[PDB]
Amino acid sequence: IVEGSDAEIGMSPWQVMLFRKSPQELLCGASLISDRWVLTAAHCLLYPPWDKNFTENDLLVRIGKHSRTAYERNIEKISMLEKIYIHPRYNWRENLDRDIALMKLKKPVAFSDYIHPVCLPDRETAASLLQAGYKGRVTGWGNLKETGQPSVLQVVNLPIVERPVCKDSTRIRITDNMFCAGYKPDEGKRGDACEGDSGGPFVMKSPFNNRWYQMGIVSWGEGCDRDGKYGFYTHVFRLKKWIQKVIDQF
């Protein structure tokens, strides 16, 4: 996270770290949506252009963390993956359309002060909160600068941007399954996700029921925190039928 701040303890209890077993390294962010399901970006697990194709045994999920590198004894929980489900129409060739994947854990994780699931939006949630100018929150242990790693989880609040502005900022084809967020050059404020933060959650706190909802998944960007560029996020509600289908079937 570039131009963010240290998160408070227990601020994002649904935050998940996807950790590569060998070599040991931060692979991506993710989120806890139930005691046995974790949500992330498809590109974190499958991206042929870079010969990325992880299988269940290549990684671990670490839940309840705060420190990036430390093993947080008596606090974090480490979980193994039973099965990975990538959206069948994930478009890695053109624009990362439908950048979403689910991971089922081998055993349910117990909730605690530091481990708790985030809500997924329904159609009304989406319509109410997904508006230009409304701010969401992105969290992660990724780079602090485009070109530099944090001691602890970083957080930044960013405004959803009008669709025409998002479209006009890039040569990539934007779809209805994406939204973008970030400040404009004239707004003064800054902040963006970066390498290591992708797959993590973009959340919003409903002012109606005071619950946190994951509206997006950190999907892509050109550079990090560049003026005139914006971060793109997978539109979670738009892909909820697929999420439900997978969880209902498996």
Binding site: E25, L60, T69, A70, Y71, I78
Partner: peptide, 6 residues
């Protein structure tokens, strides 16, 4: 720079 895990 990751601390070893159990």
């Amino acid at each position: 720079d990751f601390e070893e895990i159990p």
